[PDB]
């Protein structure tokens, strides 16, 4: 929900993606896991992607910002393979992975991805 902008300019092609992250996984908007733990993960990291998107738009995001992004989301996981089975953790995985494969300043379609 941004506060009414120009559209994305820079790393704008990327902004597109983080915000269908969301829109397949949202806590309690869509689905839900019992699990308390395991989900501390999907609330935390789904609440995070939405500070890129906004960053992103104005430029804010940077090398630290996604490097120490990673170390943020990626340690969640434990929550995951802490309790949760594999099962659940299938779910929750593809997300702190996607998060980290859209932020990932080389983000680009067209000839190749590399």
């Known amino acids: 929900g ?8 820079a790393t704008a ?13 949202a806590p309690g908007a869509r689905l839900a ?5 395991l ?8 609440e995070l992607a939405r500070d890129c ?7 804010l995001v940077t090398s630290r910002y996604f490097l ?9 996981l434990q929550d995951a393979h802490e309790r949760s089975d594999s099962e659940e953790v299938s779910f929750i995985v593809q ?9 990932s300043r080389p983000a680009r ?3 190749s991805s590399g």
Do not use: C, W
């Not at 998107?53 to 430029?59: Q, T, V």
């Not at 120490?68 to 969640?76: A, D, G, N, S, V």
């Open 2 to 9: 941004s506060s009414g902008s120009s559209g994305p300019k």
């Open 13 to 25: 092609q990327m902004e597109g993606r983080l915000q269908e992250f969301l829109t397949a996984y």
């Open 33 to 37: 896991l019992a699990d308390g733990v």
């Open 39 to 46: 989900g501390f993960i999907h609330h935390q990291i789904v």
């Open 53 to 59: 998107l906004a960053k992103s738009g104005e430029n």
């Open 68 to 76: 120490e992004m990673q170390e943020k989301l990626e340690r969640l």
């Open 95 to 103: 997300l702190v992975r996607k998060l980290l494969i859209i932020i």
């Open 109 to 111: 379609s067209g000839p």
